């Protein structure tokens, strides 16, 4: 039954994009590692921090009214 915000979420890599990276948490909700959403280090390449199979920890940054699960990658 949906989840609660403010909790941590293990974001698995289930999709990537040239202008960023997509992510999923399984259970009916997914996260997104957009290009400007990786690590303090410049990740000009989203395919470098995001990999199909790499599971990284993130934090439910929040969810606007667009149901866009905004996950926050930690520092994997």
Write the layout of secondary structure elements.
Blueprint: E1 8-17, E2 20-24, H1 46-49, E3 55-62, E4 70-73
Antiparallel strand pairs: 1-2, 1-3, 3-4
SS-based class: mainly beta
Order of helices and strands: EEHEE
CATH class: Mainly Beta
Please give the number of β-strands: 4
The CATH architecture name reads Beta Barrel
Identify the overall geometry: globular
CATH evolutionary superfamily: Nucleic acid-binding proteins
Largest sheet, spatial ordering of strands: 2-1-3-4
User: Sheet bearing the most strands, described?
Assistant: 4 strands, antiparallel
Number of domains: 1
Rg value: 11 Å
Instruction: Assess the beta-strand content as a share of residues.
Output: 35-45%
Number of helices: 1
State the CATH topology.
OB fold (Dihydrolipoamide Acetyltransferase, E2P)
Q: What is the straight-line distance between the termini?
A: 28 Å
Into which percent range does the helicity of residues fall? Answer: under 10%
Organism: Escherichia coli (strain K12)
Subcellular location: Cytoplasm
Protein name: Polyribonucleotide nucleotidyltransferase
Family: Belongs to the polyribonucleotide nucleotidyltransferase family.
């Amino acid at each position: 039954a949906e989840i609660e915000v403010g909790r941590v979420y293990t974001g698995k890599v289930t999709r990537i994009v040239d202008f960023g990276a997509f992510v999923a948490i399984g259970g009916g909700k997914e996260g997104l590692v957009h290009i400007s959403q990786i690590a303090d280090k410049r990740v000009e390449k989203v395919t470098d921090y995001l990999q199909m199979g790499q599971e990284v920890p993130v934090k439910v940054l929040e969810v606007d009214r667009q149901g866009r699960i905004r996950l926050s990658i930690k520092e994997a």
